[PDB]
Every structure is written in C-alpha cells, then in structure tokens.
Symmetry: D3
Subunit: 249 residues, 6 copies
C-alpha cells in the first residue's frame, strides 16, 4: 500500500538493483535481496515491452519497487509502463526544462498533468488509487549531457518530478572524457557534486547509477537519495570471470 522508495525518503536513501537481462527468475531473486527497488533498463538492453511486463510482476512479488529506465522521454511509452505496474520512471537524456515538463506531464492525472486514465495494474495493487496515484510513482530526469548540466536549475524547478538521476559515463563522454564505469575524472566529479548541490538546494531528490558496491557506498555517504548498484550482466560476467580463474588456478 506504499511506494517502498518514497517510504525510505519519508524516513533515508534507497538502494536499487539494475537489470539489463530479460526474464522473471533473476528479477524476483534480486527483488528479494536488500534492494528497495529494481530498475529495468529498456534503453541499453534487449528488453522490449512484452518482456518488461512480466518482470514488473516478478519484482513486486519479490517485495522491491519495480522501476523502469525508459528508452526515451516519451509520454505515451511512460504511461503504458505506469499502467503495467512500473512505480518508478527514470527518463534518459532530459536536457531542458521543456523536456522535464514532458516527463512531469506523463506522471500525473489532470489537473497536475495529462496522464491518460486506464490503470490496469495499479487499480489491482491500490484498489482508493486515484486519490493517492501521484504518490505511488517516483519520477527522475536523467542528467547526462553538458546541456543538462547547464540547465540543472531549470530542470529542478519543474514541480511534478521528484528529482534527477546522474548518468556518469554519458556525462563523462559528452564532456570529452573516457566513458569509464564509476568515472572519477576531476571535471565529471565536479559536475556531479554541482548537480547534487543544486538538487538539495531546490528541495529535490538526486540519484546516481553505480557500477560497484564500493562507488555506491561513497555516493550514499555523499547524501544521494537513490543509488543503483550494479548491472546484473556486469555482476554476472565478473563473477563468471572469477569462478573460471579459480577453476583454472
């Protein structure tokens, strides 16, 4: 009867999983670990709509909040995921206030936005739903370009979104650096600390994508509200590489 991430915030940060691999079984198993949410990546993965739909059900059963990082900031895409029981939306490449308004417009019924009414899965979870519907959903605009960085105060002024979510590898690449996992490039570190500073100054939430528990520990200690660690494919490949090395030793 509550968004698990919003419950954290009403008390603390949320730690979230991150899925690049389609399917229900790992999604349920990771949801039952000490993750507050699990994010399904529809941008940089083979996950289409038909594949994401049962994964959202698997995450909720595991007892974590089902989040989707979308392919694009498209209102109608975002609406169909909310009606399929995505209760968190991370939209990539939100570069301007107008783009942040487009995201906010998808997350709220009229009068606060233009979300189309047909809440197939949320009406089953919440039963009462319409009266609390905006609170059931967390919305974060991705900051991952020099343009998004310049427009940070503009983007954070948008009511309807909870805050921003840093894509550090795309931010590093767009600033002319190596697209390093958990990049500590001094200019990129500066930009990230600036985004976190401006989000907290406007009374908004800030999140960040991490490639490691180590990096995620530091981001939590830095006061980020929403930390993801680490992609299922990345954790699985590293574990298999270590299992093989130990076998062949």
């Amino acid at each position: 009867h509550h968004n698990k991430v919003r419950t954290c915030w009403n008390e603390r940060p949320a730690l979230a999983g991150w899925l690049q691999l389609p399917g229900t079984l790992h999604a349920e198993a990771l949801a039952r670990l000490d993750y507050d949410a699990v994010v399904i990546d529809m941008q940089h993965s083979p996950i289409d709509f038909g594949q994401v739909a049962p994964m959202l059900i698997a995450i909720e059963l595991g007892g974590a909040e089902p989040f989707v990082r979308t392919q694009v900031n498209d209102p109608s895409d975002i609406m169909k995921l909310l009606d399929a029981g995505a209760y968190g939306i991370i939209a990539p490449m939100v570069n301007t206030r107008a783009e942040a308004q487009t995201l906010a417009s998808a997350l709220h019924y009229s009068p606060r936005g233009l979300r189309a009414f047909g809440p197939r899965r949320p009406s089953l979870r919440y039963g009462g739903y319409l009266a609390q519907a905006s609170e059931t959903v967390v919305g974060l605009a991705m900051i991952e370009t020099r343009e998004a960085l310049a427009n940070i105060d503009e983007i954070l002024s948008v009511d309807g979104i909870d805050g921003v979510f840093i894509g550090p590898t795309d931010l590093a690449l767009d600033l002319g650096h190596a697209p390093l996992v958990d990049t500590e490039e001094a200019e990129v570190v500066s930009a990230i600390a600036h985004v976190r500073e401006r989000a907290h100054a406007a009374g908004k939430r800030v999140g960040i994508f991490c490639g490691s528990g180590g990096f995620a520990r530091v981001k939590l200690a830095e006061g980020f509200d929403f930390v993801t660690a680490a992609p299922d494919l990345a954790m699985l490949s590293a574990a298999a590489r270590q299992v093989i090395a130990d076998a062949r030793a």
Copy 2:
C-alpha cells in the same frame, strides 16, 4: 569445423563449462566469450522452454563456446529436435539403467548406429553437405548419474557404446543417498560415491563430468581428472554477486 569439447578431449585436456538457468541471449553470448569451452543450458529446473533455448544456442555458438543442453528428461524426440536446433552436447538427467542409457544413445546417432530422424536444419548450415559422414563426432552425449540405482548400474550404463560417458548430478545423488542436497558437499559417503563413478568411467575408457557450485571445488575436480567440469550456475553467481554489492553499498 569441430566440437570444442571433443577437441579438448582429443588434445588430452578437460573441458570447463558454464551453466545457464536464466533464459536469454545476452548473458549466454557474454559467458560463451569467457574462458569456457562449452556452455550448458538447463531445461530441467529453469523456466527455459524450447522457444527460449533455440536463440541461446546461436548466441553461445557466436561467443565461441560449444552449446550444450541438460534436457528436462531422457526423451529421444526432444533430444533429436535440440540436435537439429544446434545443440552439440546433450546431458540427460536421471539415467538409472543400461536400457535408459541405450535410449539416450539411440537419439544421438543416425541409422545404422541409432534411430535419429534425419532433418539437420542447423547442423547442415554449420557442417555443410559432408554432415552425415561426421554427425556422430559433432555431438557429445553424457548420461546423468544422480541415484543409488544409477550408482549400482554404473558398469552396465558405462558399457553402452553410443554415449561418451557420465555426468554426476551431486545434489540429487546426495539426497538419494539420505544426505543434505548441498552442492560441493564434504559428506564422506557422497565424496566416496563420486570418486567411485569417476574411477569406473575411466576404467571403462569413458568420460566423466560433474556439476560444481564454486571455482574452488571445480579446481579440485579438474585436479582429480574429471573430463567435463561445470562451474557455476548463472543465477547462483548473480545472486551471490548482488548480495556482496549490497553488503559493500550498505
């Protein structure tokens, strides 16, 4: 050109294999590209149906590993359809008798050596029109030893000509011996039974394999002379990796 596990065996060396309980092509290619000689797809304990296994075999083959399937059951017609989909290794669960081992062998070879139906959709693309002459050599076939019955019938199972050897299911074997179904068990009777099966396989000039839950245990099985070592299931490795990332983050 060649079955990469048989190439290992021919050059005097064991094969190390991955083990997939998670459906999908991306991790199947990613793990195939690691220093695994083969990758086994589990169709027994997992949600992987035939529709989901077919593209996974392609993805493993592209990554450079030999695609294997541990079937739901020792059923000839299920096995033949997987061979024709480009499964180049078959591991059949719960092979308890000489008769069941012969049923497996029958699926793996064309007439006159078995009764495999001819329609090799994917193997004819890989091997070309010369496929029939070398078909038997392109496929590796292992009967699973997971029961007291199979342990008692090991010598007669090992006498069947059309299987390469046996593959220990150590959690089922531990359970059927009255012990905890723990992977990589130290239980003396289970350890004894596993050593017994390897010794009998090697005495009969056949291959022996074993399912492992860890790199450390796989290292020992490789040093003991196991021909085909699997380590470790994608879901188990992923789950353990996530619990550690969470522990480090919190």
Copy 3:
C-alpha cells in the same frame, strides 16, 4: 472484400468489442459473436506489437473487422499496424487540427497522405488493393480533453479522417470530475452531446467507448455511428465476481 464497419455505415451503426487481454483464442471467439469489429487496446494494456499481430489474424478469421486503439497518434506506428491487417485505427489524445492532420496523413497513400507502401497483409486480403486502399481503413480521432472539445470543429474539418471517438473517463478527468465508467456527470454529458452534434453537422462519424451494454444501448439510440462495449477484462472480472458470489451463497 469490404470493411464490415463501412458496410454498416453505407446501409446503420457498428457495435464493436474491446480487448485489454493479449491472445488469439478470446479474440477469435468474441469476433464470431454479433460484433461488427473488435478493437485491440495498445494504450492501457500489456499488448505490444508482437502480441497484437496474431490477434488481428484471429479477429479477421472470426469474421469481425480488426481495429486497434493505438498507444499514441504516431504515423509510423499506425502504418505498421495497417500493413499487419488493422483495418480500423482509433488514435488517443487528438487535441488539435494539426494532430488530426498527422492521423489523416498515416491512413492514405500519396497524393491524399504520405502512407508508406508495403501492404504485406492487406495485399493478401484484397489482392485491386491500391485502387480501394483508403476505403478498406476506418480512422477516428479521440476526443478526451477540454482542448480537443474546444477544437472540435477544427478536428472535424480534416478530410482524411472518418470522424471522432469519445473517451468519456479521460474527458471527465480533464474537466475536473471523477473518472467514472459510463460517467453521467452533467458537464461531461453536455460536452459529449456537443461533440456528437458537431460531428453530424460536418457530415462525419462519431463513436464512443462504453463500459456496459446498457450505456451502449442509449448511445446507439442517441445516433452514435460506432459504439464499443465492453472491455474483455471488465466483463470477465464482473462475471467471475458473480460466479464466486453464486458459489458462496
């Protein structure tokens, strides 16, 4: 060799089904009932493209006209559904004449629109096709916002569309009311009667989404050209609730 809904109109209103549930078996069974068309909802459902494709085939075999209510008024989405054998398109959230022109542009080959030529399934049904292709397809713009209501005459002036299709729950919500199934909110009833009046005055068709046979009876008697009743999920849940009550009595 004809659009079953257009045949009704050339003689009478069309009564249509409405699917929120993916799959072929219920789609064929409902198509064989006394429905002129069956609408597949790709907005407020788990139905992706791969799932809709075989449902269109199942509806045609049942002998009803296959319709799709799309996720969004996107030309290229609409074109791919027409080439998969959708012979009716209902586009949601058509708020302006420009948006109604975008819908019209997808439904017609040049010179009447810009529909891309590759009619995989219609060429199999019609064999002759190009010469009649516009007549094989029914197009309706959804009116479900106060903006769409204000622009009704603008939207109805667009050649290329057959008419409009009322979304009464979204219209009620956007006008500041409860999103009630078959809403009789006096302001919403007024707006709907106005839309029907203006559609018939411009010589265009008007349709309406209904949640019940009762409401659909009244809309047919009011002279609506295209009436849908009722969602498969809604009919199934209500039937199961009554079966359980009778079992437990």
Copy 4:
C-alpha cells in the same frame, strides 16, 4: 508461508478455484485477487505452453491465490518443471489406474518418498533454505477421474499415499459413459458416478474435487461436501458476458 488450499483443508473448509484457458498475466492476477483460494491454469485444452504458464504462476501468486496447473498429461518430468516454476498444485488428467496414480505421486515428493529431481528455483525463493523439510506439504496433487476405467479403479487410485485425492473431469466422464459431454449435467448415471467418487474418496480419507461451469452448480457441489470446486472457465465466462452485453446493446 503456506499452501492456501491446504490451509482451507486444515481449517475444515473447502477451496473454491478459478480456471484459466486464456494465456496472459493481467486476468490471472485480476481473478487471483477475487474470493478464489486457488486459480488453475489449463495446459491440456488451451494454447498455454510452458513459456506462457511461467509468468501466469507469478501473477496468480501476487494476487493472493494458490497457483495450480492442470497438466497436458500425467508425465513426471513435465510436473517437476512446473513445481520448480512455482506451481503449488498439480491436477493430472486421465489417471485411470493405481500405476498411473503412483506415477503422479512419484513426481510430487523428493527421495525417499518419490523421485522428484532437486532444483527448486522458485519454491526456494518463496520458502527459503527450510524448503526440503516441508516441500511435500507445500504441494497439492489430485489425480483426474474422467473414464469408466478410472471409475472401476477408484479404490486402488485412492490407496496411493502421495496424492491428496481425486478431481472429477465431468464432460470426459459423461462422454465415456455414453452421454452428452455437457458440463453440470443432470444425466442420472453421470450424477450417480460423481456422488460414488466423492463417497469413496471421503471413505478413504482423501480429498475430492470437481470442475463446474456455473456458480449455481458449484454451490450444490460445495453443499455436497466437495473439497476443491472450480467455477468457471475464463473463456466460457467471458463469452457468456459478451453475448449478454451485445444482447443488451442491440
């Protein structure tokens, strides 16, 4: 924590279950959230293959009902894969003999009580590491009685320890008795046979269930003391609901 049908049975009360012939997760969750104790997915007469059943079981479990499967056939390895996918009830069609009932029982219990293969992917997530000790109790198993053969062999079918009891297939039973395959039949011989099967089940201290086409007929079966009543198939309820909406609209 517990199988909701067994909890009903333990607290002295019958179970009412839904019946799905339509694949997909949305209606499966919607019906599971109604006052049904279980929801049965039909894999015999429907287009539901293994790939389509797997997410449906998840969706029923989330809705709060016990996920059941009426299998295509009484096949041990098919049954074991469904158990490992989180099917917590099994209804096996066309169980005609004590031997076939024993084949069903064998699939449902780990050694030493049956021969179920150990790899409980979804049950180990629900039940945790204590699963092995309580596995048998987490699963409900019913043998279907749908033939004159099964009716003649009812007492020997009911003597098998590893099944909870029987589930009447009344359209097949009516047909095999030489009568119209009508659901909720008034045909005196079919009615007699159904009462006979319930009385024998209850005399043997086993459960009895029946497939129903209507709420009214289900009410009577519940009053007659049936332990497990299904009412009614999603496609039948949907079809009847659409014909009435159409009738009212026109």
Copy 5:
C-alpha cells in the same frame, strides 16, 4: 464447414500441400492463399514450439488451406492439444508397428472409438455445437513410414481403422535402407519401396502420401496416384530462390 483434404478425397482428387519449417504467420498465410489444399507445419526438424504453431494454424485457416502438423513424435497428449488448437491434419513420424499406429488412432477419435480428451477450444468455434457428431471426419490422420521396420509392418499398420493411411518419409527411409538421405531419390531400392507402400495402401483402401523436394518430382507422384503430395519446404524453396537472385545479381 469441411476438411478441404477430405473434400479433395471425396471428389476423387489428390491433395497438394505446402511444408513449413520456418515459424511465423505471414508466409503461412501467403502460402495458404496459393493453390495448396493444405499446409503442413513441421514440429519435428524445425524451431517451431507449441507457442509458435498456435497462431500459424489460424493464419493457414484464414488463407483458405487446411492446417496440418507433422508432430515431433507420435504422443497422444501432444496430438490432442494440437487438435484443440485447430490442427485439422496430423502426420506422426516414425510409426513402425501396428501398436504405434493404434496409439495415433487413439488420439484422433473421442470415446467410444478412441480416448481423445474432450475440450475442443478452436474446433467448437469453427464447427459449433454439432462438433461431437462429426469430429472424426473433421480430422485427417497419417502414420509416417520411414524405416525398414515400418516397411515390414506396412500391412498391419494399414489394418488400423482410425487412421486415413500412411505418409512416406523418403530421406529417413533411404537412410535406414543404407542409401544417401537424398530427397526425390532415383535409388532403385528406395523407389521400389515407395511404390510397394503406395500399392499396399491402395490395396487396403487407405490413402498414401509422400514428402517431395521439387515440383517436377511432385508431378510424377501425383501421376503415380499419391493421395497427399507435399512440395516443397519453405526454407529449401527460399534458400534456392536467394542463391539464384544472388547468382543473377553478381
């Protein structure tokens, strides 16, 4: 209204059928709309699982041809599920004995003539409430002859009342006779065996069919009096068509 192959047979004429090894609905409808009386979906040698066959049957029926399935195996419960999905013809591979032919026949007919389970989801939509009375006539059933065993047992296979006749698997038959598994073979012993099977089928008042790789070979089989001729697999026709387009382009 009627099975289009049986309508051919009743009007004194053979049936020509297509043969699909490629999953999907678009080519299945496109080929069904050509001058084919039936289209066979191959579930033995192809990547077509149950989930992929179900919409293909719909697509063939819409195109105007009778939907047929060559099953993976002669398994009654697999056959019954395909009948209930709107497969109106069944071709069972590797039918070697009278007993196996009786197993096929049992799947195809309701009690009292066979043991087919009653739940005809798609046939009841096509045929209506009068389906039970005419069910047997709506389905065509052929046992495949592809082994020396089946050739020796042809007369006893042909004595089974509940199958329409036999369907030659000529590549498997050539292989089992010790010859190259070439389609449309000129090998004298294979040609002789094929003529022998047709003559025995026709002497027993049953139908005979044959799988062909070419239009030219199909023409000859039609002139020889084959009742059911398939020509030629979608993948083979597509592959040959692409090699010619490439040859012409380069």
Copy 6:
C-alpha cells in the same frame, strides 16, 4: 573485427539480403549465402524489437553484416538497435537536412553525435570498440518522396551519414505513378539517376532496394554502392507459385 560492407567499399559494391519474415533459421541460412549484409525490415513486417534481437545474432553467425531498415528515423530506436548489434541502419522517409542530422546524431558518440553509451553487443564483438565505434556502423538516409528528391544536395551535405538509399516504389507513388516493384517509369528512372549522380558528386554512397536479381544486376552495373535483392517473402511466394505450377502441370 570489421564491417563487411565497409570492407567492400574500402576495396567494390555490397549485395544485401532483405527479410520481412521474423525468425533465426532463414536469417542464418541467407547470411551464409554470398550476401555481404542482410537487412531486417522493421517498417513493413510483423518484426518487433523482441523478434529482431535474435535475428541480428543469427545473421552475424552466418557471417553477413546485420542491417536494420527501421520503422522510423527515431534516434532512441536506432540507438537500441546499435546496442543489440545492428551494424547498418537504413532510416525511411528522410526528407530534409534536419531529418538527416537526426539520423547522423544517433550513429556517433559525442562529440560527432549524441549516441547514448551502453554498447551491450558491440563491446562483446569489438572488445578497442570506442576508438573505432563510428566505423563499425553504416548509416543510410532513405530517399522516397518528391521532397527528399528536391532536398537531395542538403541531405548529402550531412557529415555523419554514409549516404542515401532509394525506395523506388514509394518514390514512384509520391510522384503520382503506380507503386510497381523495380519500376522503370521514365520520371522515376530520371529521379533515381539524379540521386545517384548527386551522391557520387558529394563523395557519398548510394544504395537501392531491388525486387529481383535482374534489376540488381543493372543497378550494380550503374555503380550503386549498396544493392538489396530480394525480399524473403517475395522470393518464397514466387518459388512456391512455381513449385505448385510444376506439380499441377
């Protein structure tokens, strides 16, 4: 370790296949023939994202370059296909320089474009990837409208795209002619020869869709850099029609 089509060009034209039918088996078999690339059509087919993903893997294994003709010139669609191992993109209905810039922006990382970084499948193929990533991908803008024809020099001036790809049936239809397969309509033939002339004058590649080996032979002899022949459905239907005619003779 190279794009097979780019290798042709660095030496010769590329001949490519064209798939309208979903599935891996024909995709692998056609890839192993003497095709340099195989194009999967997501515009005029039942192929959704979940269906295209394994087909790309099947084509690469066969040893041809996996290409996709997209439903639409949508950056985020194009990015998700590149991260799934599409190494050629043909975007339909590219009518203006701005539209050609939108295509170019999807194909290149910053600073040359805005491609989002998460190369799941290319990182597995190339291992080194980022340093050569633009060279691994071929991009072609479709010319199939009178507007695209008028703007040809504009479109060809865009850096980031390799060239253009002619859709002759849509070009014929938009110019007021019959949408004939391999059309030789004199005005359409003129327009095509003009597009080829202007592409080669700007030092860019030109490709063309063919319905036959005969037409494709002539286009190769005319100096087209990228020739497709012929759709799998079209080749299969024609072969089946000839097999039936020979059987019934």
